[PDB]
Amino acid sequence: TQAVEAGEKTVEQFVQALNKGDYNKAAEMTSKKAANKSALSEKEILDKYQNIYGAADVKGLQISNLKVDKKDDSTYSFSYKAKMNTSLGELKDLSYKGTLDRNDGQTTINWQPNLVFPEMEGNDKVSLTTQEAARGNIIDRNGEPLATTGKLKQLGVVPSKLGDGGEKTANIKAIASSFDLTEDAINQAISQSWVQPDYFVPLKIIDGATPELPAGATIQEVDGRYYPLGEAAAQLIGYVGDITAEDIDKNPELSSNGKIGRSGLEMAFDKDLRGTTGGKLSITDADGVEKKVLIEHEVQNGKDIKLTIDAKAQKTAFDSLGGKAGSTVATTPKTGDLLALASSPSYDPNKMTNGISQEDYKAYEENPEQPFISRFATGYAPGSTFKMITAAIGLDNGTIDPNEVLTINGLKWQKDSSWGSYQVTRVSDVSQVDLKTALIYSDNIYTAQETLKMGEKKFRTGLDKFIFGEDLDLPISMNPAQISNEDSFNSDILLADTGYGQGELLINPIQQAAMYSVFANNGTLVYPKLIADKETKDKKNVIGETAVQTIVPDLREVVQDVNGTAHSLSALGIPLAAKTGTAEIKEKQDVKGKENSFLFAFNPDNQGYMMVSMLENKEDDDSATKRASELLQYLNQNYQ
Numbered sequence: 001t002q003a004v005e006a007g008e009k010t011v012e013q014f015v016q017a018l019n020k021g022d023y024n025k026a027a028e029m030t031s032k033k034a035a036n037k038s039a040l041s042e043k044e045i046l047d048k049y050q051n052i053y054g055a056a057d058v059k060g061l062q063i064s065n066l067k068v069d070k071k072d073d074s075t076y077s078f079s080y081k082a083k084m085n086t087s088l089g090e091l092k093d094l095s096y097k098g099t100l101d102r103n104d105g106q107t108t109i110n111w112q113p114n115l116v117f118p119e120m121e122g123n124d125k126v127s128l129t130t131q132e133a134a135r136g137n138i139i140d141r142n143g144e145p146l147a148t149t150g151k152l153k154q155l156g157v158v159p160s161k162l163g164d165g166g167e168k169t170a171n172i173k174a175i176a177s178s179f180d181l182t183e184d185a186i187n188q189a190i191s192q193s194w195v196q197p198d199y200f201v202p203l204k205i206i207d208g209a210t211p212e213l214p215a216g217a218t219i220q221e222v223d224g225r226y227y228p229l230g231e232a233a234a235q236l237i238g239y240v241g242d243i244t245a246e247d248i249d250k251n252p253e254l255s256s257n258g259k260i261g262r263s264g265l266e267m268a269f270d271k272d273l274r275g276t277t278g279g280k281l282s283i284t285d286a287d288g289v290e291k292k293v294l295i296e297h298e299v300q301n302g303k304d305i306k307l308t309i310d311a312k313a314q315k316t317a318f319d320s321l322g323g324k325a326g327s328t329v330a331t332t333p334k335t336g337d338l339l340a341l342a343s344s345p346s347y348d349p350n351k352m353t354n355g356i357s358q359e360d361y362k363a364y365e366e367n368p369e370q371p372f373i374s375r376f377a378t379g380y381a382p383g384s385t386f387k388m389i390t391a392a393i394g395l396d397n398g399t400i401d402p403n404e405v406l407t408i409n410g411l412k413w414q415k416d417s418s419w420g421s422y423q424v425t426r427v428s429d430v431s432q433v434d435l436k437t438a439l440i441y442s443d444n445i446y447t448a449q450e451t452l453k454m455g456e457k458k459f460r461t462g463l464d465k466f467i468f469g470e471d472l473d474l475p476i477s478m479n480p481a482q483i484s485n486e487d488s489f490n491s492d493i494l495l496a497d498t499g500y501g502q503g504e505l506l507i508n509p510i511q512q513a514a515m516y517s518v519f520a521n522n523g524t525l526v527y528p529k530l531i532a533d534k535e536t537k538d539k540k541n542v543i544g545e546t547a548v549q550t551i552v553p554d555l556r557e558v559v560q561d562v563n564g565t566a567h568s569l570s571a572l573g574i575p576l577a578a579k580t581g582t583a584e585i586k587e588k589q590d591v592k593g594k595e596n597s598f599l600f601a602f603n604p605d606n607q608g609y610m611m612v613s614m615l616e617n618k619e620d621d622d623s624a625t626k627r628a629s630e631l632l633q634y635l636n637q638n639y640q
């Protein structure tokens with residue numbers, strides 16, 4: 001039985017080498033070329049597998065049900081079932097069979113062309129025909145296009161019809177000034193090594209009306225992905241890029257001639273958007289007549305995907321950031337629909353997917369404000385806005401009396417001398433501060449004191465009812481929000497800092513809109529939702545209903561009171577509840593401290609919408625509040 005042991009080993013070593021793509025090592029386990037031995041030599045077995053398995057992009061060959069028996073005295077017969085992955089899907093239940101050879105102290109495989117595919121004879125060919133699937137569309141809550149396939153106007157030049165000598169320089173300057181192009185860049189395009197004097201050298205895509213075409217300029221229609229909102233939704237949607245040979249090795253079911261999502265929803269929903277390649281993989285005669293069809297099915301185009309996004313709100317939210325670093329999240333807080341996910345600054349996804357220069361791409365990467373960051377999915381310290389949560393927790397466990405008045409003298413405060421030179425700082429020197437006053441003026445010292453009075457254990461008990469540590473069901477890469485680095489603060493200072501939204505808190509804007517939704521649902525947290533068809537999910541009894549009825553009237557005062565931190569929003573004349581905030585940061589970079597500005601705002605009459613905006617590393621006298629009027633006007637009109 002020691003012979004069939006070595007035969008089973010030989011067959012599995014042969015299958016392993018085929019699975020790994022080392023066709024040479026597989027061929028060197030075959031017998032000499034003869035009639036009842038190997039049908040081909042080693043070098044032509046190599047080329048057989050390399051051409052056929054390479055044409056169909058075979059990957060992941062694995063066998064089962066291996067039986068090795070005895071035929072003659074030195075001839076052992078094997079058989080097994082097998083499956084493999086190709087460019088047209090998985091190929092299952094393949095019945096392979098053959099014979100072995102025990103000559104000296106080694107066993108080899110009598111190779112036959114039926115060990116490539118079952119039922120191949122001598123000189124049979126393999127044919128593969130494919131039809132590429134059309135990529136699906138991404139559309140908003142009202143069916144407007146966010147990412148669609150269609151026809152684009154491609155501009156290029158033919159160096160021959162452009163002219164020579166001084167005739168050339170005049171036309172090149174005419175092209176460069178008629179389409180906003182660098183005169184030195186048109187020459188670098190026509191000077192590339194691939195160019196022949198008569199070829200059409202593409203230059204850029206024209207996304208509007210095309211002016212007069214000077215001599216040598218041409219315009220050709222071409223199919224390609226198009227993003228109608230451009231940079232206004234680049235971080236969310238993403239972009240597609242040309243598929244590489246290294247992508248095909250990872251997943252053979254891609255179209256080597258098509259596009260793959262590189263970031264954003266295009267990448268998160270690539271499998272649903274790309275569809276499936278249609279076609280047929282068949283074995284033919286030495287002539288070419290069809291012997292057996294191995295795989296065949298029709299092309300299935302990609303499904304469309306409907307988002308909760310509002311295209312008008314998304315554009316308004318992004319424009320309001322004015323190219324500064326920041327982000328804005330808008331929801332309908334009773335259902336969790338994500339109306340807008342803006343991040344700024346941004347990149348051009350149309351320029352990204354239609355070929356971008358090395359310099360322009362580096363300008364994006366070297367940009368200190370980093371336009372590639374999805375800021376709506378990046379953990380930040382929430383800032384003073386978080387005082388709402390601490391207050392609601394304090395009202396639930398009875399630590400905070402809404403009418404008790406703390407007496408605060410000055411702008412700085414510390415628990416005792418053990419804090420050293422550290423002090424909680426506030427902006428307004430109000431002496432008598434109750435809860436309503438602390439929310440109107442945004443008083444850290446009040447919140448820091450009520451947090452320390454509450455204590456860590458009661459503070460965390462309230463915080464644990466939220467979504468810290470949870471993974472939201474969203475097709476957006478993000479990390480779970482955290483209260484702090486460890487399970488305990490181990491610091492009175494860190495406890496007070498966390499009270500008014502500083503410390504080691506990390507919560508991204510989407511997770512913030514989820515937590516703050518309790519004030520629009522009588523203490524019920526409503527999870528955010530991006531896919532329009534999905535069902536609303538929530539989480540009851542996060543904070544008490546009594547706390548909501550207490551805090552929301554005070555949040556109205558943040559807008560209506562003449563000294564409220566959001567009083568500029570009272571100009572809108574719409575029912576508003578708001579809370580502004582500030583987070584001071586930086587630690588191991590520059591000496592000057594950087595400041596983040598926050599705004600939370602929702603309609604407290606109908607709970608129709610909710611907004612969380614931020615400015616990262618704000619310039620002086622800039623704030624999220626002074627930029628929010630236009631989006632609030634829109635959301636109030638169209639989402640009651």
Ligand SMILES: *C(=O)[C@H]([C@@H](C)O)[C@H]1CC(SCCNC=N)=C(C(=O)O)N1
Binds near residue numbers: 384584
């Ligand atoms: C949080 O409540 C902040 C505090 C942590 O800085 C306070 C201060 C601000 S206003 C910005 C003053 N400059 C530097 N701190 C408010 C606010 O309502 O924005 N809350």
